């Protein structure tokens, strides 16, 4: 219906990163078919985990907001939730690993005392993750060994990393030089592709869950869609009323990209700019 369920004055300063979780508590059944859980970290040293009442189903008939609040020593810069076993990692002064049964961080996983701009978990082989810090550096980590594992340094700072949900060892990497690199993990000496069509900083990228299209959104007021196998732009969206697109995400339908500008709006776009969404008759589909 393109409306909002609930709003929250979530923090005081800038919000930095949020993700949703189906957080399995141990002293509580996961009631995840009647209420949905999102958590959000800001730069005022707080990471809040919230419930949301949601009429996706109609099974039941009340615990609306602020389930709990993890609080940290330093600030926080980003999160993402490990999609199994209710674990989530954050970044800030150094990356921390919490789970939702502790108010204190379970582990601390940096290389040195250097801040970390963004993180991302996998979509499969979930126990490893990647991050990016303002030493212009890409780090990988492995929670099975519970340690960082490798580190490359590029020529400019990586803004947003994103794993592939069909390769499980490839990721894209969006940095301030105007080209989204595409790395293979187990040989990090060569960026096995480079998507090279912008004019300004590449503020975010994401893979479509079909596993071959890249959405990107630049610091200049434009988003682009690439294919993986080419290396130049398939095509480009822009409008006069969006400025400085900061976050783009494919939807799970793999046809609709959600872009969010700096003007305030969260616009939506069709990926294929001509395929309509109605169910079509068989001669028309042919």
């Amino acid at each position: 219906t393109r409306e909002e369920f609930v709003s929250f004055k979530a923090h005081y300063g800038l919000v930095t990163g949020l993700c949703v979780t189906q957080p399995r508590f141990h002293d509580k059944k996961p009631d995840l078919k009647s209420q949905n859980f999102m958590l959000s970290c800001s730069d005022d040293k707080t990471v809040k985990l919230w419930s949301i009442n949601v009429d996706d189903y109609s099974n039941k008939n009340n615990e609306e907001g602020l389930i709990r609040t993890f609080d940290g020593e330093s600030a926080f810069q980003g999160i993402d939730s490990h999609r199994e076993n209710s674990t989530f990692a954050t970044g800030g002064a150094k990356i921390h690993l919490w789970d939702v049964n502790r108010l204190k961080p379970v582990s601390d996983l940096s290389w040195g005392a250097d801040n970390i701009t963004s993180l991302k978990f996998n979509q499969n082989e979930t126990d490893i993750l990647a991050s990016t810090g303002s030493d212009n550096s890409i780090v990988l980590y492995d929670l099975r060994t519970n340690s960082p594992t490798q580190k490359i340094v590029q020529t400019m700072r990586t803004n947003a990393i994103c794993w592939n949900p069909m390769e499980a060892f490839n990721f894209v990497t969006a940095n301030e030089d105007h080209n989204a690199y595409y790395y293979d993990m187990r040989n990090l000496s060569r960026s096995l592709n480079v998507f090279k069509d912008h004019v300004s900083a590449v503020m975010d990228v994401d893979f479509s869950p079909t596993g071959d299209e890249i959405v990107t959104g630049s610091y200049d007021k434009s988003i682009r869609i690439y294919k993986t196998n080419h290396g130049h732009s398939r095509e480009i969206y822009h409008t006069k009323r969006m400025q400085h697109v900061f976050q783009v995400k494919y939807s799970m339908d793999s046809k609709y990209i959600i872009s969010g500008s700096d003007d305030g709006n969260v616009r939506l776009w069709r990926s294929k700019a001509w395929e309509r969404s109605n169910v079509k008759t068989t001669r028309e589909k042919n």
């Binding site: 219906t1 393109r2 939807s251 339908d253 046809k255 609709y256 939506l268 969404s277 109605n278």
Partner: peptide, 8 residues
């Protein structure tokens, strides 16, 4: 049915 574009 198309869920995301269900107001079109």
């Amino acid at each position: 049915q198309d869920d995301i574009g269900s107001r079109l």
